[PDB]
Ligand binder design. Structure first.
Ligand SMILES: *Cc1ccc(C(=O)N(C)CCS*)cc1F
Ligand SMILES: *Cc1ccc(C(=O)N(C)CCS*)cc1F
Ligand SMILES: [Cl-]
Ligand SMILES: [Cl-]
Ligand SMILES: [Mg+2]
Ligand SMILES: [Mg+2]
Ligand SMILES: [Mg+2]
Ligand SMILES: [Mg+2]
Ligand SMILES: [Mg+2]
Ligand SMILES: [Mg+2]
Lengths: 7, 236, 236, 7
């Protein structure tokens, strides 16, 4: 699970 | 440059077509041409600029991580020497990624930021500046690394200061900025507690302001809140 | 060209890294450099060449279809006039796609095909030649369209003739060639009955030869047979 | 459902 950035 | 002979409106129209066709390199080139016309960008045009470059650099970053992992394994004990090719190719991708970041930062400096006076535009561009310095920081290993990290921090901090004064806590730009600055703290600045605090405080303040929103705004804000929650669940 | 100073083995190594990183444009450029060294390609190297260019042209073809659909809608009655931009951008993507096809066809002509004497290599390259003429035919609308279609047909036909004489009916190259020639018949040559007959006959002859195969070869052949079956189910 | 070619 990769952390979220604003995409 | 190459887009100087195309009308601004045609560049915008073609950027939208390129998005539909998933041709993000073309999309970015069209939007760079539109910015270079020298007029300010509308909300929709700023979004097109952001989408285009985020997709281009996102592909480069993913490729860089694949190559960096292979290179790391190659430097583990017991790994066979395979020559300079892995390093060379990782460096090629890295240089191309840095070039795209420098291109975006150049558009922001000449002259998007200085002409942006409304909070929604100024915060958006400062967030972008923090993002592209953060992408430079992801690959930085040398003597400028601290200054690259501080450039990201400074841009994010000015965007935060404006967003807190001028935007509601549910504003999507304010929320996306906080999400990205929290990621910066966690994985660039070695400050996981600051990252967690920022994500939690941002989430809770947005929650408290949801009652003021229409159904459509509620959907926009809660979508980004869920990203903050995703990170809090991963990090705690 | 730009790869002339890199060692053949380094180009192959970097093509494999580019595949892992999903950098198919780089992969194709590396494999073009490897072909231009002038030595014949091994089975694995032919596969790398094919993967690289099929991914590059596959992205262009998908984008072309999106843009062509938009352009078609724009020429329907009741659609507003939006100017030349949709046509211009579809033409830009089309020209780039044609350039990639011409590049692959040029490698095949100078000098992969003429040096390929074993059935496995010669059939593979002739299949490729048929494929890239078929991609040219997908976008052709003018006076050379019939000759482009006949160039695809002729390359596929010579590959079929060799494959039937020299390869077993379960050979993956023979099967993939038949799959693609069947698609050519269905959607390029306006010959759906020929397409269906070829797919059915290819499937049935492979089925009858499966008993001769190891478990691993059986898996390879049945995977492609399922693609033939998928098309038969769609077309009947 | 798009027809299959050899990919
Ligand atoms: C800068 C920025 C903020 C917010 C959005 C947005 O609304 N999203 C749904 C993306 C995830 S934060 C987009 C943006 F570009
Ligand atoms: C030319 C060619 C034939 C066959 C294959 C293959 O084994 N596949 C599993 C792809 C689907 S036909 C690949 C090839 F490039
Ligand atoms: Cl390289
Ligand atoms: Cl164009
Ligand atoms: Mg003008
Ligand atoms: Mg202004
Ligand atoms: Mg306000
Ligand atoms: Mg040499
Ligand atoms: Mg030979
Ligand atoms: Mg034989």
């Amino acid at each position: 699970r990769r952390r979220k950035s604003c995409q | 440059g190459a887009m100087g002979s195309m009308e601004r409106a045609s560049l915008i129209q073609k950027a939208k077509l390129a998005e539909q066709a998933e041709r993000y390199e073309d999309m970015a080139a069209f939007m760079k041409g539109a910015v270079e016309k020298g007029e300010e960008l509308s909300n929709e045009e700023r979004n097109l600029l952001s989408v285009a470059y985020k997709n281009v650099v996102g592909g480069q970053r993913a490729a860089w991580r694949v190559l960096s992992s292979i290179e790391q394994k190659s430097n583990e004990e017991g790994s066979e020497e395979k020559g300079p090719e892995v390093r060379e190719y990782r460096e090629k991708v890295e240089t191309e990624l840095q070039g795209v970041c420098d291109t975006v930062l150049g558009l922001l400096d000449s002259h998007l930021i200085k002409e942006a006076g409304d909070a929604e535009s100024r915060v958006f561009y400062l967030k972008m500046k923090g993002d592209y310095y953060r992408y430079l920081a992801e690959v930085a290993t040398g003597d400028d690394k601290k200054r690259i990290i501080d450039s990201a921090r400074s841009a994010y901090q000015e965007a935060m200061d404006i967003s807190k004064k001028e935007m509601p806590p549910t504003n999507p730009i304010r929320l996306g900025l906080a999400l990205n600055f929290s990621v910066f703290h966690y994985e660039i600045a070695n400050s996981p507690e600051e990252a967690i605090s920022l994500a939690k405080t941002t989430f809770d303040e947005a929650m408290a302001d949801l009652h003021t929103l229409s159904e459509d705004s509620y959907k926009d804000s809660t979508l980004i809140m869920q990203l903050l929650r995703d990170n809090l669940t991963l990090w705690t």
